[PDB]
Amino acid sequence: RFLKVKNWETEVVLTDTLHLKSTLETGCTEYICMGSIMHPATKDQLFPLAKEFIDQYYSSIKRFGSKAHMERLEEVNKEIDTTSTYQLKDTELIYGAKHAWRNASRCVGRIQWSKLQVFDARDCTTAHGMFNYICNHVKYATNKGNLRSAITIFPQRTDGKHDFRVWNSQLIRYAGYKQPDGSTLGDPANVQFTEICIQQGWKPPRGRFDVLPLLLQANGNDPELFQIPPELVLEVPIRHPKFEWFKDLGLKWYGLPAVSNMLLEIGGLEFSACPFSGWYMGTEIGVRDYCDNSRYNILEEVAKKMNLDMRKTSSLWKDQALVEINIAVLYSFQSDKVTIVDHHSATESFIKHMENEYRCRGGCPADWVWIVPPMSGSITPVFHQEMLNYRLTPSFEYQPDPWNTHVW
Amino acid sequence: CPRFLKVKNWETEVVLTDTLHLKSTLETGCTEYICMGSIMHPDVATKDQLFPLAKEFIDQYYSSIKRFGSKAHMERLEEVNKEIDTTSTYQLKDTELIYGAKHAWRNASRCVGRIQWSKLQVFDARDCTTAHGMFNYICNHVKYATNKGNLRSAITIFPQRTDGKHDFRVWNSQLIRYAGYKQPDGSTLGDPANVQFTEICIQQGWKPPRGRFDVLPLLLQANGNDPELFQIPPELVLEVPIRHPKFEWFKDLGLKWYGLPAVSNMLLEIGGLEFSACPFSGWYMGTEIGVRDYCDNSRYNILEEVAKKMNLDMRKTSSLWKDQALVEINIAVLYSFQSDKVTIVDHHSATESFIKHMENEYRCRGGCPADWVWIVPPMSGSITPVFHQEMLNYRLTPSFEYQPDPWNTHVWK
Ligand code: HEM
Ligand code: HEM
Ligand SMILES: Cc1cc(N)nc(CCc2cncc(N3CCN(C)CC3)c2)c1
Ligand SMILES: Cc1cc(N)nc(CCc2cncc(N3CCN(C)CC3)c2)c1
Ligand SMILES: C[C@H](O)[C@H](O)[C@H]1CNc2nc(N)[nH]c(=O)c2N1
Numbered sequence: 150r151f152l153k154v155k156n157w158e159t160e161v162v163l164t165d166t167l168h169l170k171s172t173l174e175t176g177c178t179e180y181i182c183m184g185s186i187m188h189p190a191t192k193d194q195l196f197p198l199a200k201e202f203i204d205q206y207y208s209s210i211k212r213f214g215s216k217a218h219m220e221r222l223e224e225v226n227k228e229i230d231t232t233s234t235y236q237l238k239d240t241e242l243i244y245g246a247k248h249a250w251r252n253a254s255r256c257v258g259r260i261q262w263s264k265l266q267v268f269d270a271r272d273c274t275t276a277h278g279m280f281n282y283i284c285n286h287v288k289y290a291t292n293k294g295n296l297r298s299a300i301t302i303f304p305q306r307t308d309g310k311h312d313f314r315v316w317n318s319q320l321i322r323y324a325g326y327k328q329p330d331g332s333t334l335g336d337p338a339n340v341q342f343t344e345i346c347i348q349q350g351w352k353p354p355r356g357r358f359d360v361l362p363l364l365l366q367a368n369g370n371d372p373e374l375f376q377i378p379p380e381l382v383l384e385v386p387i388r389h390p391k392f393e394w395f396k397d398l399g400l401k402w403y404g405l406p407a408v409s410n411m412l413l414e415i416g417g418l419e420f421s422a423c424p425f426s427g428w429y430m431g432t433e434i435g436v437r438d439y440c441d442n443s444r445y446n447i448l449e450e451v452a453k454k455m456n457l458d459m460r461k462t463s464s465l466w467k468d469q470a471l472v473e474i475n476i477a478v479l480y481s482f483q484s485d486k487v488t489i490v491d492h493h494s495a496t497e498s499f500i501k502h503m504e505n506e507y508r509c510r511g512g513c514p515a516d517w518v519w520i521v522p523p524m525s526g527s528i529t530p531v532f533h534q535e536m537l538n539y540r541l542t543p544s545f546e547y548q549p550d551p552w553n554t555h556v557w
Numbered sequence: 558c559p560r561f562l563k564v565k566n567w568e569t570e571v572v573l574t575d576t577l578h579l580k581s582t583l584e585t586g587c588t589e590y591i592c593m594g595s596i597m598h599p600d601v602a603t604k605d606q607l608f609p610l611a612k613e614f615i616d617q618y619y620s621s622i623k624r625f626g627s628k629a630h631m632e633r634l635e636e637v638n639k640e641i642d643t644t645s646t647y648q649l650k651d652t653e654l655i656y657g658a659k660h661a662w663r664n665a666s667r668c669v670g671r672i673q674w675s676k677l678q679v680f681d682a683r684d685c686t687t688a689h690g691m692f693n694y695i696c697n698h699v700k701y702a703t704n705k706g707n708l709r710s711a712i713t714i715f716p717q718r719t720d721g722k723h724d725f726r727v728w729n730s731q732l733i734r735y736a737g738y739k740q741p742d743g744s745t746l747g748d749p750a751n752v753q754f755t756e757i758c759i760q761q762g763w764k765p766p767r768g769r770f771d772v773l774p775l776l777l778q779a780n781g782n783d784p785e786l787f788q789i790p791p792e793l794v795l796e797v798p799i800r801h802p803k804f805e806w807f808k809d810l811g812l813k814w815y816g817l818p819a820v821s822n823m824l825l826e827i828g829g830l831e832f833s834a835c836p837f838s839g840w841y842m843g844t845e846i847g848v849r850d851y852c853d854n855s856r857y858n859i860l861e862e863v864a865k866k867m868n869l870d871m872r873k874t875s876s877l878w879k880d881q882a883l884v885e886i887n888i889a890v891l892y893s894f895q896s897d898k899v900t901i902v903d904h905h906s907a908t909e910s911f912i913k914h915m916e917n918e919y920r921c922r923g924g925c926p927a928d929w930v931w932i933v934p935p936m937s938g939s940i941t942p943v944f945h946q947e948m949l950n951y952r953l954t955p956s957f958e959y960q961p962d963p964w965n966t967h968v969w970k
């Protein structure tokens with residue numbers, strides 16, 4: 150069946166044919182939908198997957214059934230036979246990484262999908278090696294404010310035992326500190342991890358915005374600590390254009406969003422260490438990081454300085470403070486010439502992207518729950534965009550947190 | 558399928574365990590390969606389709622009154638069975654109807670207001686025969702529910718469907734709405750969403766005032782007959798002029814809204830019986846008016862005009878002028894309503910209440926189906942607890958369902 154998606158603001162209908170290509174699961178069934186749940190190999194399992202991916206590769210470069218296509222299939226089988234795995238060609242690495250991005254149902258930034266710088270770190274063997282590759286990534290992608298999308302890809306999983314893992318969930322995050330008095334310094338969501346670094350020898354500057362060091366595991370070994378050189382870590386001070394007292398709140402944030410805990414899957418190979426990075430949508434910092442109760446939780450403070458009536462919730466004081474906070478973040482980043490996108494422009498870009506995808510690909514998997522900004526939802530166009538969600542490969546998937554699996 | 562499904566709250570780490578999903582009856586639209594979570598909408602039943610459905614409901618009822626397997630239970634079952642066999646249908650007891658309607662609400666996965674599910678005045682209009690009768694019942698509903706501003710939840714149930722050629726239908730999608738008029742020049746006046754329906758009314762004889770907030774008449778279908786127009790007595794239609802606690806200019810925008818939210822186009826399904834006309838009503842969450850009715854582009858679209866009187870930079874977008882104006886609009890909506898002593902609930906309170914409700918439903922009922930996409934308010938989502946709440950969505954019966962628009966299916970006599 151061909152499936153139709155409607156936009157309820159423009160009454161545009163698009164026809165999804167793409168979903169017929171998907172093979173992974175979604176977690177839903179005919180009777181139970183899990184749309185809001187965050188998280189729902191051997192020689193024999195590994196070949197057809199390999200066959201599938203090569204097939205869509207030579208399909209995407211107009212050489213299906215070609216001579217080059219055949220020998221590649223030949224190469225792969227013989228290689229899976231005698232090593233229980235196989236190694237991707239370069240061109241294949243780039244395609245697969247770009248396509249996992251293109252297939253990432255939760256990313257609103259996919260208009261950018263084909264413009265991705267891929268770093269091949271498959272020759273890496275040590276944590277020192279990784280640190281090096283990551284630093285170069287961070288510097289390339291940060292580019293002095295003019296952010297560029299990138300991904301760095303370390304050796305594929307072999308036997309589970311000798312996995313490569315960046316332990317930090319993101320390349321750049323602030324430390325969180327448990328205080329005797331029950332409160333918490335810095336980012337509360339990182340306290341456990343922060344505690345693992347102190348427990349490893351990290352001398353923590355017990356501050357509010359301390360850049361956690363890198364914890365890098367190479368080839369199944371003990372992870373090792375590495376402080377990223379401060380000159381490569383770009384932070385932005387947050388100020389407000391009308392409220393001169395906003396800089397007194399002392400807020401900064403890093404400019405480079407780089408996810409490092411996900412697993413990139415291509416033709417049945419598992420790349421358990423693939424830090425990737427684009428640039429920030431304002432709301433991520435402005436709404437989630439700053440205003441989640443489980444996070445930096447600044448609303449109450451900001452609402453004080455704004456002199457709002459905080460007695461009853463129906464003064465929408467929280468809403469007011471939230472808006473001004475996000476104005477600040479955009480203003481700061483913009484003033485510092487640091488790439489950032491506001492949620493209106495990012496969502497617009499997404500609807501345009503989505504139209505493109507249907508036009509040339511026959512669909513575009515999308516997770517409405519993740520795509521719709523965490524504030525001002527129905528005033529962005531994706532709120533009114535029906536989206537079909539489904540899982541295409543290559544893809545980014547979650548994996549266990551390393552500290553729940555590794556033996557020392 | 559799995560017997561225990563766990564949902565997590567990412568703000569509070571609270572993990573709940575759903576068992577109720579096993580009693581899921583209908584399809585969600587989703588499959589293992591694809592999810593339709595964000596899709597808005599993803600001749601009668603026979604004897605042998607009806608027996609099992611009726612029993613399921615009756616069993617469930619007698620389970621709730623702690624009389625399962627009782628004499629009265631088996632006698633109720635035999636009576637219903639013998640009724641379906643001789644008449645091809647059956648009639649619900651008044652207690653069964655009341656239980657069924659409260660439970661359809663309780664099961665309404667899209668409703669953030671369900672904490673009130675058990676307080677619902679149920680008006681049994683199964684004795685209605687004419688559109689005039691329908692109008693009488695609906696007026697009485699409006700008056701009772703409005704309660705001079707202190708709204709009370711209510712539903713009025715008109716006769717169940719028989720052969721499909723004799724349906725009772727309320728044609729209005731909601732009992733109280735504002736007209737929309739298309740102009741020659743392409744501009745819309747009033748509520749652009751209701752243009753199609755306003756034209757139907759005009760065609761059926763309505764003489765339109767052609768203003769911005771003209772209350773549409775009821776268009777009512779009884780017993781499968783052609784529909785008839787009625788104007789709700791204006792004294793029954795409570796309205797609230799929108800003003801702002803701070804901006805004195807806000808009242809200059811000439812905005813008002815109706816107090817009573819009343820859905821009238823949905824089908825109420827109890828034990829295999831279909832009540833195609835079952836208008837029900839509660840009270841408003843601010844964002845419904847403040848964000849959707851007022852700021853949707855396809856609706857009243859006031860964002861720009863509020864943005865100009867606020868004097869905001871409207872040339873960028875990263876000024877977030879839209880967002881600023883949106884907050885203010887919703888402050889005015891909550892203010893005008895509270896100031897006229899008309900029941901309304903802000904999105905913070907409502908969503909917190911839903912979390913308490915949900916938790917209690919898992920505790921006592923083993924689950925509570927919820928549609929995250931609908932539950933999360935259309936503004937400031939992340940700062941309301943529901944956003945962080947994992948939800949399972951599944952369709953339980955009795956339920957409220959969607960149904961074709963009557964002008965698309967009606968056969969004109
Ligand atoms: C270039 C500008 C980009 C923008 C503006 C953007 C925007 C976003 C945003 C706002 C989210 C939500 C993040 C969260 O709430 O945790 C997200 C998620 C995601 N993005 Fe992008 N992104 C960009 C680049 C990229 C790149 C380069 C990749 C991969 C190479 C990518 C893949 C993903 C994935 C897999 C997720 C889901 C993360 C998860 O499941 O936690 N994005 N994106
Ligand atoms: C008592 C106060 C109530 C509140 C605060 C409330 C809240 C809400 C809200 C905000 C929506 C979304 C409306 C929209 O976006 O169009 C909704 C939808 C819904 N509500 Fe409630 N509600 C209340 C009463 C009721 C009652 C009495 C019933 C039924 C007996 C009910 C059943 C439903 C159903 C079936 C929907 C889905 C509507 C649709 O599919 O368009 N609600 N509710
Ligand atoms: C590729 C990419 C683009 C983008 N705009 N944002 C991201 C998320 C990056 C990111 C950085 N720091 C922290 C997080 N956390 C916030 C808290 N959340 C629970 C997990 C993600 C996420 C990734
Ligand atoms: C029982 C009930 C409670 C409540 N808080 N809201 C409702 C919805 C009432 C309502 C009134 N007017 C119009 C609508 N429309 C808005 C636009 N939407 C597309 C369809 C519903 C809905 C019903
Ligand atoms: C496309 C999407 O399903 C649709 O726009 C939904 C989003 N969530 C909603 N939530 C509520 N309460 N009401 C709505 O009309 C909608 N619209």
Ligand SMILES: C[C@H](O)[C@H](O)[C@H]1CNc2nc(N)[nH]c(=O)c2N1
Nearest residue numbers: 185186187518519944945946947
């Ligand atoms: C439970 C729910 O899925 C959770 O709050 C989701 C909702 N949508 C989200 N959307 C984005 N972009 N990021 C998130 O972390 C989440 N969290």
Ligand SMILES: [Zn+2]
Nearest residue numbers: 177182587592
């Ligand atoms: Zn689903």
